[PDB]
Design a protein around this motif. Structure first.
Motif, PDB file in Angstrom:
ATOM      1  N   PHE A   1     -53.067 -52.737 -60.167  1.00  0.00           N
ATOM      2  CA  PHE A   1     -52.256 -51.527 -60.635  1.00  0.00           C
ATOM      3  C   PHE A   1     -50.770 -51.803 -59.709  1.00  0.00           C
ATOM      4  O   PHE A   1     -49.846 -51.648 -60.156  1.00  0.00           O
ATOM      5  CB  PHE A   1     -53.018 -50.355 -60.046  1.00  0.00           C
ATOM      6  CG  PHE A   1     -51.870 -49.193 -60.095  1.00  0.00           C
ATOM      7  CD1 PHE A   1     -51.500 -48.642 -61.318  1.00  0.00           C
ATOM      8  CD2 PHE A   1     -51.440 -48.478 -58.998  1.00  0.00           C
ATOM      9  CE1 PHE A   1     -50.473 -47.416 -61.095  1.00  0.00           C
ATOM     10  CE2 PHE A   1     -50.269 -47.586 -58.819  1.00  0.00           C
ATOM     11  CZ  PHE A   1     -49.977 -46.947 -60.097  1.00  0.00           C
TER      12      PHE A   1
ATOM     13  N   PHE B   1     -46.211 -35.203 -55.541  1.00  0.00           N
ATOM     14  CA  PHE B   1     -46.385 -36.090 -54.788  1.00  0.00           C
ATOM     15  C   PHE B   1     -48.096 -36.536 -54.515  1.00  0.00           C
ATOM     16  O   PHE B   1     -48.534 -37.495 -53.746  1.00  0.00           O
ATOM     17  CB  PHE B   1     -45.972 -36.234 -53.431  1.00  0.00           C
ATOM     18  CG  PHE B   1     -44.232 -36.104 -53.390  1.00  0.00           C
ATOM     19  CD1 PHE B   1     -43.765 -34.958 -53.355  1.00  0.00           C
ATOM     20  CD2 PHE B   1     -43.811 -37.489 -53.242  1.00  0.00           C
ATOM     21  CE1 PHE B   1     -42.490 -34.805 -53.416  1.00  0.00           C
ATOM     22  CE2 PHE B   1     -42.385 -37.378 -53.483  1.00  0.00           C
ATOM     23  CZ  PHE B   1     -41.614 -36.034 -53.502  1.00  0.00           C
TER      24      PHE B   1
ATOM     25  N   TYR C   1     -35.275 -52.837 -55.990  1.00  0.00           N
ATOM     26  CA  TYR C   1     -36.560 -52.710 -55.290  1.00  0.00           C
ATOM     27  C   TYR C   1     -37.138 -53.825 -54.392  1.00  0.00           C
ATOM     28  O   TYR C   1     -36.861 -54.817 -55.066  1.00  0.00           O
ATOM     29  CB  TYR C   1     -37.526 -52.105 -56.279  1.00  0.00           C
ATOM     30  CG  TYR C   1     -37.568 -50.592 -56.596  1.00  0.00           C
ATOM     31  CD1 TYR C   1     -36.704 -50.326 -57.653  1.00  0.00           C
ATOM     32  CD2 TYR C   1     -38.432 -49.987 -56.123  1.00  0.00           C
ATOM     33  CE1 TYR C   1     -36.563 -49.181 -58.001  1.00  0.00           C
ATOM     34  CE2 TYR C   1     -38.215 -48.516 -56.527  1.00  0.00           C
ATOM     35  CZ  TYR C   1     -37.375 -48.179 -57.451  1.00  0.00           C
ATOM     36  OH  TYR C   1     -37.400 -46.781 -58.026  1.00  0.00           O
TER      37      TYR C   1
ATOM     38  N   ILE D   1     -46.572 -45.684 -51.119  1.00  0.00           N
ATOM     39  CA  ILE D   1     -47.486 -45.082 -52.341  1.00  0.00           C
ATOM     40  C   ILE D   1     -48.876 -45.476 -51.564  1.00  0.00           C
ATOM     41  O   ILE D   1     -49.124 -46.521 -51.560  1.00  0.00           O
ATOM     42  CB  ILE D   1     -47.215 -46.016 -53.397  1.00  0.00           C
ATOM     43  CG1 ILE D   1     -45.653 -45.943 -53.868  1.00  0.00           C
ATOM     44  CG2 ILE D   1     -48.100 -45.555 -54.550  1.00  0.00           C
ATOM     45  CD1 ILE D   1     -45.484 -47.067 -54.809  1.00  0.00           C
TER      46      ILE D   1
HETATM   47  C1  LIG Z   1     -45.640 -40.809 -62.550  1.00  0.00           C
HETATM   48  C2  LIG Z   1     -46.373 -39.787 -61.579  1.00  0.00           C
HETATM   49  O1  LIG Z   1     -47.429 -40.679 -60.404  1.00  0.00           O
HETATM   50  C3  LIG Z   1     -47.770 -40.084 -59.086  1.00  0.00           C
HETATM   51  C4  LIG Z   1     -47.768 -38.529 -58.875  1.00  0.00           C
HETATM   52  C5  LIG Z   1     -48.203 -38.185 -57.503  1.00  0.00           C
HETATM   53  C6  LIG Z   1     -48.955 -39.229 -56.524  1.00  0.00           C
HETATM   54  C7  LIG Z   1     -48.654 -40.553 -56.826  1.00  0.00           C
HETATM   55  C8  LIG Z   1     -48.017 -40.942 -58.290  1.00  0.00           C
HETATM   56  S1  LIG Z   1     -48.050 -42.796 -58.591  1.00  0.00           S
HETATM   57  C9  LIG Z   1     -46.410 -43.236 -58.310  1.00  0.00           C
HETATM   58  C10 LIG Z   1     -45.218 -42.565 -58.278  1.00  0.00           C
HETATM   59  C11 LIG Z   1     -44.036 -42.641 -58.097  1.00  0.00           C
HETATM   60  C12 LIG Z   1     -43.712 -44.022 -57.781  1.00  0.00           C
HETATM   61  C13 LIG Z   1     -42.034 -44.436 -57.383  1.00  0.00           C
HETATM   62  C14 LIG Z   1     -41.432 -45.660 -57.670  1.00  0.00           C
HETATM   63  C15 LIG Z   1     -40.247 -45.870 -57.361  1.00  0.00           C
HETATM   64  N1  LIG Z   1     -39.390 -44.816 -56.959  1.00  0.00           N
HETATM   65  C16 LIG Z   1     -39.799 -43.620 -56.528  1.00  0.00           C
HETATM   66  N2  LIG Z   1     -39.040 -42.947 -56.006  1.00  0.00           N
HETATM   67  C17 LIG Z   1     -38.725 -43.086 -54.666  1.00  0.00           C
HETATM   68  C18 LIG Z   1     -37.448 -42.844 -54.190  1.00  0.00           C
HETATM   69  N3  LIG Z   1     -36.699 -41.495 -54.925  1.00  0.00           N
HETATM   70  C19 LIG Z   1     -35.356 -41.606 -54.694  1.00  0.00           C
HETATM   71  C20 LIG Z   1     -34.331 -42.712 -55.154  1.00  0.00           C
HETATM   72  O2  LIG Z   1     -34.724 -40.507 -53.899  1.00  0.00           O
HETATM   73  C21 LIG Z   1     -36.911 -41.494 -56.545  1.00  0.00           C
HETATM   74  C22 LIG Z   1     -38.561 -41.417 -56.782  1.00  0.00           C
HETATM   75  C23 LIG Z   1     -41.252 -43.332 -56.802  1.00  0.00           C
HETATM   76  C24 LIG Z   1     -44.474 -44.907 -57.683  1.00  0.00           C
HETATM   77  C25 LIG Z   1     -46.213 -44.779 -57.950  1.00  0.00           C
HETATM   78  N4  LIG Z   1     -47.225 -45.567 -57.916  1.00  0.00           N
HETATM   79  O3  LIG Z   1     -46.976 -46.827 -58.114  1.00  0.00           O
HETATM   80  O4  LIG Z   1     -48.180 -45.598 -57.534  1.00  0.00           O
END
Ligand SMILES: CCOc1ccccc1Sc1ccc(-c2ccnc(N3CCN(C(C)=O)CC3)c2)cc1[N+](=O)[O-]
Length: 184
Positions: A26, A158, A39, A108
């Motif tokens: 994953f 989250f 990133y 994460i």
């Molecule tokens: C799709 C929803 O998935 C989930 C819901 C709850 C908990 C975990 C997950 S998995 C999940 C959710 C979000 C992200 C992710 C990847 C890149 N950027 C972000 N942000 C951080 C910076 N932020 C800014 C620029 O202000 C924007 C969003 C996040 C990765 C995962 N993952 O890999 O695992």
């Protein structure tokens, strides 16, 4: 801007070999999809103690996700979640390890059970925290709630609860729908 994202995955003894492997695949798929972007990644395994499988500097020089996570040894111990997060905020997010000062910090967390330690994660307040709980150890609502204190708020955004490791694929597909090319 730039984004420094750290993967903090569970390596407890509860995890079966194939399940542990699915957690690594994953992480790789997430990295692969976001490669060649602004990133940068780093991965840390946690159980009783912690270990940075690879840091930002390693990612920049190698990039290849499969190679960065090829020498990971499943710790098979406890789940000291609190100490792990602290370790990430004070031993991983650092310039000495390729972390970019301007980057937005993201973490994460991936676990299969409730924490076996206690304390506080104040040292990571400035970090955007996501947490995925997987498995039968999160069958009841009360067990799921215990993860809320580790993730940012709201919990509906989250905190992801997966009943099986197979659902990680469903999460990856749901995650990609949020990928966009934004400049302004
Ligand atoms: C799709 C929803 O998935 C989930 C819901 C709850 C908990 C975990 C997950 S998995 C999940 C959710 C979000 C992200 C992710 C990847 C890149 N950027 C972000 N942000 C951080 C910076 N932020 C800014 C620029 O202000 C924007 C969003 C996040 C990765 C995962 N993952 O890999 O695992």
């Amino acid at each position: 801007g730039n984004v420094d994202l750290v993967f903090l995955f569970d390596g407890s003894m509860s995890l079966q070999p194939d399940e542990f492997q699915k957690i690594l695949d994953f992480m790789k798929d997430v990295m692969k999809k976001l490669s060649n972007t602004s990133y940068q990644f780093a991965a840390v395994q946690f159980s009783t103690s912690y270990k940075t499988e690879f840091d930002f500097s390693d990612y920049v020089k190698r990039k290849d996700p499969d190679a960065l996570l090829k020498h990971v040894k499943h710790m098979l111990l406890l789940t000291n979640t609190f100490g792990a997060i602290n370790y990430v905020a004070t031993e991983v997010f650092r310039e000495e390890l390729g972390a970019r000062p301007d980057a937005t910090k993201v973490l994460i967390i991936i676990t299969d059970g409730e924490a076996t330690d206690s304390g506080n994660i104040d040292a990571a307040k400035d970090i955007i925290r996501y947490i995925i709980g997987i498995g039968k150890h999160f069958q009841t609502k009360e067990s799921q709630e215990t993860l809320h204190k580790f993730a940012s708020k709201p919990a509906s955004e989250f905190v992801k609860i997966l009943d099986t490791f197979e659902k990680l694929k469903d999460l990856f597909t749901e995650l990609q729908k949020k990928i966009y090319v934004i400049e302004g």
